[PDB]
Amino acid sequence: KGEELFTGVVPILVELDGDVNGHKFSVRGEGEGDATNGKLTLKFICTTGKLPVPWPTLVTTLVQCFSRYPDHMKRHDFFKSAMPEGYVQERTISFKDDGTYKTRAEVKFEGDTLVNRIELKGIDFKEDGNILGHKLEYNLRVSTPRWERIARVLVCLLGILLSLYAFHVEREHARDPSYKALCDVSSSISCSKVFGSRWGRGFGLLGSIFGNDSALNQPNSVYGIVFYAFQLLLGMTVSAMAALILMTTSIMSVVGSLYLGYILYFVLKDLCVICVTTYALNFILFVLNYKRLVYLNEAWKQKLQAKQDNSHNVYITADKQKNGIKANFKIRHNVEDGSVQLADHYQQNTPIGDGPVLLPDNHYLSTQSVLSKDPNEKRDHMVLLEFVTAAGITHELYKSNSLEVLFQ
Ligand SMILES: CC(=O)C[C@@H](c1ccccc1)c1c(O)c2ccccc2oc1=O
């Protein structure tokens, strides 16, 4: 079925020609592939000299037909169905705040060899950018875990909404005596009585400790806006300086939330869901910044590169209109200063020959990469080892022994 062609070892040859802002280069890689275990191993050499771009930015471009599909999901393996005829893989890689890659590739069998021929076009790249300036780390690890990166963005976005709304209640209630906010309903459930109180501007202190009309003296929500924004955008760089600056400010959040929360319950005897959540949001930020400092202390443990945290998902969906598939995912390169260079991926696959192919359901390919070097090779090279396995398929469980044994 073409899936029979991947039950053993398959030699792999890749070739890539491209020009990026005028700079041309050619890459040739050689190796084999084990689809039964979801593994590939290749050694790429830039035949023209020095690669004008960092090696990790070309890992995604340089044969998903060696993915391991469990016996459940082998119904959804489009890549092996299109073989030996092959498929055409076009991509668009957009680097945030920089240029974009434009690739087209033909993946096909040539004798007993799986061959990938690629053409790349790099357009509108900044020279001293993280790409054409060679500023990226030589790996494909994730500096911040996925489920923690999502926790940061969601809580900081929620913190800005709540603080901006708290600023809305403070400024209008001070100007309009007939104004009632959504949290102003009954006495003991009143925003205006909390923000309009003494402790609502500069935490009650630092006014009459400062001029009481100064610029520092400000509604407490304003400090949150600056804090949540500062935590959101610097919180993606994983550095030494950027780590303690996040932990320093996050401590100031917990000492201010504890102070403010005390006055809310015991002094004012009030209730404010916007205040309680912002306290919770600030406590979540504290423990997330605490993780990174132990991520930095255990640096030796984390140079391993092969950990399942360093994996990337490639979400696939069908394309019945063209008898193919399309996919999207994101890659976050590690730049030498600690921040992140984002790279948007948009993929489209179309079979070469005209035969029965297997259009899949919405699943994804979990991928991991290991980028090594060779001391004997003097040219600009890269040793690669990848791991692709499919996931995202189910098995509801009415027929479960626990529920069934209760219902006899
Ligand atoms: C939820 C807000 O943005 C306003 C809130 C607050 C919470 C944490 C840090 C800054 C600001 C707020 C209140 O909790 C509050 C509670 C008691 C007394 C005064 C308060 O003023 C506030 O602005």
Burial class (CB in 10 A: 0-12, 13-18, 19+), 128: exposed
DSSP annotation string for 287-327: HHHHHHHHHHHTHHHHTTS-SGGG-EEEEEEEEGGGTEEEE
- Nearest by Cα to 54 from 295, 331, 303, 318: 331
Are 357 and 351 in contact by the 8 Å Cβ rule? The answer is: yes
H or E stretch at 152: helix 146-173
Report the C-alpha gap between 266 and 183 in whole angstroms. Answer: 19
Neighbours of 348 (CB within 10 A): 17
Q: Sign of the CA dihedral 54, 59, 60, 61?
A: positive
Q: Which residues are 314's β-sheet partners?
A: 365
Phi and psi angles of residue 207, each rounded to the nearest 5 degrees, phi first? -120, 125
Burial class (CB in 10 A: 0-12, 13-18, 19+), 166: buried
Annotated binding site for (S)-warfarin: which residue ranges? 220, 279
Type of residue numbered 82: A
Query: Which residue of 194, 201, 276, 281 sits with most ligand 1 atoms within 8 Å of its CB, as the best mutation to test the pocket?
Result: 194
H or E stretch at 23: strand 23-34
Angle among Cα 350, 67, 328 to the nearest 5 degrees reads: 55
Query: Which residue of 275, 279, 285 sits with most ligand 1 atoms within 8 Å of its CB, as the best mutation to test the pocket?
Result: 275
Type of residue numbered 86: G
- Nearest by Cα to 327 from 336, 335, 318: 318
Report the C-alpha gap between 383 and 402 in whole angstroms. Answer: 50
Nearest atom within ligand 1 for CA of residue 197: 19
Q: Which residues are 101's β-sheet partners?
A: 93, 122
What DSSP character marks residue 145?
-
Are 62 and 113 in contact by the 8 Å Cβ rule? The answer is: no
List the residue whose alpha carbon is closest to atom 20 of ligand 1.
200
User: Within 13 A of 157's CA, how many CA atoms are on the CB side?
Assistant: 6
Tell me how far the alpha carbon of residue 293 lies from the centroid of ligand 1, in angstroms: 28
CATH code of residue 208: 1.20.1440.130
Tell me how far the alpha carbon of residue 275 lies from the centroid of ligand 1, in angstroms: 5
Annotated binding site: which residue ranges? 220, 275, 279
| Token output for 27 | 């890459």
Are 168 and 160 in contact by the 8 Å Cβ rule? The answer is: no
DSSP annotation string for 316-379: EEEEGGGTEEEEEEEEEEEBTTS-EEEEEEEEEEEESS-S------SEEEEEEEEEE--SS--S
Q: Sign of the CA dihedral 393, 329, 45, 351?
A: positive
Type of residue numbered 375: P
Report the C-alpha gap between 334 and 135 in whole angstroms. Answer: 9
Residues composing the chain: 408
**SS3 at position 260:** helix
Listed in sequence order, the residues at least 6 apart from 195 whose beta carbon sits closer than 8 Å to its beta carbon are 166, 169, 170, 173, 219, 220, 221
For the chain, breaks with the C atom over 2.5 A from the next N come after 62, 395
What DSSP character marks residue 210?
S
| Token output for 316 | 């696939």
Query: Which residue of 169, 198, 220, 262 sits with most ligand 1 atoms within 8 Å of its CB, as the best mutation to test the pocket?
Result: 220
| Token output for 96 | 């945030």
| Token output for 403 | 């529920």
List the residue whose alpha carbon is closest to atom 7 of ligand 1.
275
Nearest atom within ligand 1 for CA of residue 219: 23
List the residue whose alpha carbon is closest to atom 12 of ligand 1.
275
Report the C-alpha gap between 179 and 190 in whole angstroms. Answer: 12
Are 21 and 34 in contact by the 8 Å Cβ rule? The answer is: no
Annotated binding site for phylloquinone: which residue ranges? 275, 279
Technique that determined the structure = X-ray
What DSSP character marks residue 136?
B
Listed in sequence order, the residues at least 6 apart from 398 whose beta carbon sits closer than 8 Å to its beta carbon are none
**Residue 185 sits in which domain range?**
147-301
| Token output for 135 | 């500023």
Type of residue numbered 141: R
Are 386 and 65 in contact by the 8 Å Cβ rule? The answer is: no
Burial class (CB in 10 A: 0-12, 13-18, 19+), 359: middle
List the residue whose alpha carbon is closest to atom 4 of ligand 1.
221
Report the C-alpha gap between 79 and 352 in whole angstroms. Answer: 11
Residue listed under structure tokens 């390919």: 365
Type of residue numbered 122: G
Neighbours of 216 (CB within 10 A): 11
Q: Which residues are 315's β-sheet partners?
A: 328, 364
Report the C-alpha gap between 290 and 310 in whole angstroms. Answer: 20
Type of residue numbered 201: R
**SS3 at position 159:** helix
**Within 6 Å (CB) of ligand 1, which residues are found?**
162-163, 166, 194-195, 197, 199-200, 220-221, 224, 256-257, 260, 263-264, 274-275, 278
Tell me how far the alpha carbon of residue 147 lies from the centroid of ligand 1, in angstroms: 28
Tell me how far the alpha carbon of residue 262 lies from the centroid of ligand 1, in angstroms: 11
Phi and psi angles of residue 16, each rounded to the nearest 5 degrees, phi first? -140, 125
Tell me how far the alpha carbon of residue 208 lies from the centroid of ligand 1, in angstroms: 19
Are 84 and 63 in contact by the 8 Å Cβ rule? The answer is: no
DSSP annotation string for 35-84: TTTTEEEEEEEETTSS-SS-GGGGTTT--GGG-B--TTTGGG-HHHHTTT
Residue listed under structure tokens 């001293």: 128
Tell me how far the alpha carbon of residue 237 lies from the centroid of ligand 1, in angstroms: 28
Expressed in Å, this structure's resolution amounts to 2.9
Tell me how far the alpha carbon of residue 273 lies from the centroid of ligand 1, in angstroms: 10
Listed in sequence order, the residues at least 6 apart from 287 whose beta carbon sits closer than 8 Å to its beta carbon are none
Tell me how far the alpha carbon of residue 243 lies from the centroid of ligand 1, in angstroms: 26
Neighbours of 133 (CB within 10 A): 16
Listed in sequence order, the residues at least 6 apart from 405 whose beta carbon sits closer than 8 Å to its beta carbon are none
Query: Which residue of 189, 221, 265, 276 sits with most ligand 1 atoms within 8 Å of its CB, as the best mutation to test the pocket?
Result: 221
Phi and psi angles of residue 216, each rounded to the nearest 5 degrees, phi first? -65, -45
Listed in sequence order, the residues at least 6 apart from 379 whose beta carbon sits closer than 8 Å to its beta carbon are 45, 46, 47
Residue 46 Rama label (left phi>0; alpha psi -120 to 50; beta):
beta
